[PDB]
Amino acid sequence: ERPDLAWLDEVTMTQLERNPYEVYERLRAEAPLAFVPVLGSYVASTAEVCREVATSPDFEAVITPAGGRTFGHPAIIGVNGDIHADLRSMVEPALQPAEVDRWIDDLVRPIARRYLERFENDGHAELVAQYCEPVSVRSLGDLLGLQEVDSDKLREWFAKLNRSFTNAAVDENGEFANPEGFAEGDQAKAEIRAVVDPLIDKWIEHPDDSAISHWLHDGMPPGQTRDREYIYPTIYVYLLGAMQEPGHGMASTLVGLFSRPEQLEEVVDDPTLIPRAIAEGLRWTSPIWSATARISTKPVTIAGVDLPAGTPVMLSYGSANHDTGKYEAPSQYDLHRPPLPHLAFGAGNHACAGIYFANHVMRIALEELFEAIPNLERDTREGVEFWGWGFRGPTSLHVTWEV
Ligand code: HEM
Numbered sequence: 424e425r426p427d428l429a430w431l432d433e434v435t436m437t438q439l440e441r442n443p444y445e446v447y448e449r450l451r452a453e454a455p456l457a458f459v460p461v462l463g464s465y466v467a468s469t470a471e472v473c474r475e476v477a478t479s480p481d482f483e484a485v486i487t488p489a490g491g492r493t494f495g496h497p498a499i500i501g502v503n504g505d506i507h508a509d510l511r512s513m514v515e516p517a518l519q520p521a522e523v524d525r526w527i528d529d530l531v532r533p534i535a536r537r538y539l540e541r542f543e544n545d546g547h548a549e550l551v552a553q554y555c556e557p558v559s560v561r562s563l564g565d566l567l568g569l570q571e572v573d574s575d576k577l578r579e580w581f582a583k584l585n586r587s588f589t590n591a592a593v594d595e596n597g598e599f600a601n602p603e604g605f606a607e608g609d610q611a612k613a614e615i616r617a618v619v620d621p622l623i624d625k626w627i628e629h630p631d632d633s634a635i636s637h638w639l640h641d642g643m644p645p646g647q648t649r650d651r652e653y654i655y656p657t658i659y660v661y662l663l664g665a666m667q668e669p670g671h672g673m674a675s676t677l678v679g680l681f682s683r684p685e686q687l688e689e690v691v692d693d694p695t696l697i698p699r700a701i702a703e704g705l706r707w708t709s710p711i712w713s714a715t716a717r718i719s720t721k722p723v724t725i726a727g728v729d730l731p732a733g734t735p736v737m738l739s740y741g742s743a744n745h746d747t748g749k750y751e752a753p754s755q756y757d758l759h760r761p762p763l764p765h766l767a768f769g770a771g772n773h774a775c776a777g778i779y780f781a782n783h784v785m786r787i788a789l790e791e792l793f794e795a796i797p798n799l800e801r802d803t804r805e806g807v808e809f810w811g812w813g814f815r816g817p818t819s820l821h822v823t824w825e826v
C-alpha cells in the first residue's frame with residue numbers, strides 16, 4: 424500500500440459510478456498508475472500511461488475480473504495469440520470500411536426514420552430510450568442476424584450485461600463484494616442462449632448474409648463451423664458494448680451540444696460538422712470509460728511503479744480523455760477543439776474493431792434527428808444524470824420542441 428494515496432482506501436464503488444472524474448483528476452496528478460482498493464487493481468488514468476500499457480509489448484489483453492465472470496472464455500477482448508487472431512479475422516469482414524460503405528446508409532437511415540416517426544410530432548421525447556438506444560441496437564441487431572429480437576429486449580440485455588460486467592467492487596480480502604450482482608448477467612446470458620441457439624442451428628445448415636452466420640462459416644474447412652461455445656463470448660462482447668456504445672456516444676454528443684447552444688445551432692445548420700461533434704462527444708464522455716484491461720507478461724516499470732509479471736492494469740480511457748497535458752478545460756464540451764488524437768476507441772492490437780461502423784451509425788442517427796426536429800431543445804426542467812464507471816453515458820435526455 425502506497426502511503427500518500429491512503430485517501431484511495433475511502434473511495435467507494437458508488438462514488439465512481441455516479442461521477443469518477445474528481446477521483447481521477449487526483450489520480451492523474453498524484454499517481455498516473457495507481458492501485459485502487461475497491462477495484463482490486465492498478466488503474467491507468469493518464470493518456471500517456473493508457474496508451475503505453477495498451478500498446479506495450481510487455482503487456483497483453485486480459486478481461487477485468489467482473490468482466491471475465493460475466494463473459495467467460497474466449498472473449499475477443501480477453502485473449503491473445505492465435506485465438507485472438509482467429510476471432511479478429513472472424514469479426515472483421517462486415518466491419519471493413521469498403522464493406523460498411525456499401526450498405527450502412529440503407530441499414531441505419533430507415534431505422535432512424537422508423538423510430539423518429541413514433542415521436543417527431545409530439546413536442547417532447549426522452550431521447551435515450553426513444554431514439555439513441557433503439558437506433559444503436561436495431562442497426563447492429565439486424566447486421567448480426569437478430570432481426571427478430573425486439574429493440575426493447577436488446578436494450579434490456581446490454582443493461583444487465585453492463586451491470587454484471589462492471590460489478591467490480593472487492594472487499595477487504597480482495598473478494599467480490601457483491602456476488603449477487605452477477606445473477607442478472609447470468610440470467611441475460613440464459614435468455615440469449617434460448618433465442619440464439621435456434622438461430623445458430625439454422626445458420627449451420629443454411630448460411631445467410633448475417634454476420635453471425637459468417638462468424639460460424641468464414642474461413643472454415645468445407646462443411647465445418649466454429650463451435651458455438653467458441654463464439655458465444657464474443658457474441659456477448661457485442662451484446663454489451665457494441666449494442667450499447669453507439670447509443671451512448673450519440674446521447675453524450677447531444678448533451679454536450681445542448682451545453683453549448685451556439686454549437687448545437689452550428690451543427691443543425693451545417694450537418695457536415697456532425698462527425699467533428701461526435702469525436703468531441705466521445706472524448707468529453709467516453710462510452711467505454713474503464714472497461715478495458717491489460718496484464719503484464721514480464722516485470723515492467725510503468726509511471727515509476729515496478730510491476731511484477733502477471734499484474735493487471737485497468738485502462739481508464741475516459742479519464743485519459745480528460746488529460747490536461749493534452750486538452751484545455753477538458754470537462755467542457757467544445758466542438759471547436761482542434762481535432763487531436765483520443766483514446767475512446769482504445770489503442771494497439773486490441774483497439775476497437777468497429778470504429779468506422781460505429782461512427783457512421785452515430786452520424787446517420789444525428790443527421791436524421793436534426794433533419795426531423797431542427798428546433799430540438801433540451802428540456803431544462805429535467806436534469807441529465809450520467810452514470811457508470813466501466814461504461815458511461817446519460818441515463819436520460821429529455822428534450823422539447825415547438826410543434
Ligand atoms: C461509439 C461506440 C463505440 C466505442 C466508444 C467503442 C470503444 C471500444 C474500446 C475502448 C474498446 C477496447 C479497445 C482496447 O482494447 O484498447 C473497443 C474493443 C472492441 N469494439 Fe468497439 N467501441 C464502439 C462501437 C463498437 C461497435 C458498434 C462494434 C461492433 C460492430 C465494436 C466491435 C469492438 C470489438 C470486436 C472490440 C474488441 C477488439 C479486440 O479486443 O481485439 N465496437 N471498442
Ligand SMILES: COc1cc(C=O)ccc1O
Nearest residue numbers: 660661663664665714715
Ligand atoms: C465492444 O464491446 C466491449 C468492449 C469492452 C472493453 O473495451 C468490454 C466489453 C464489451 O462488450
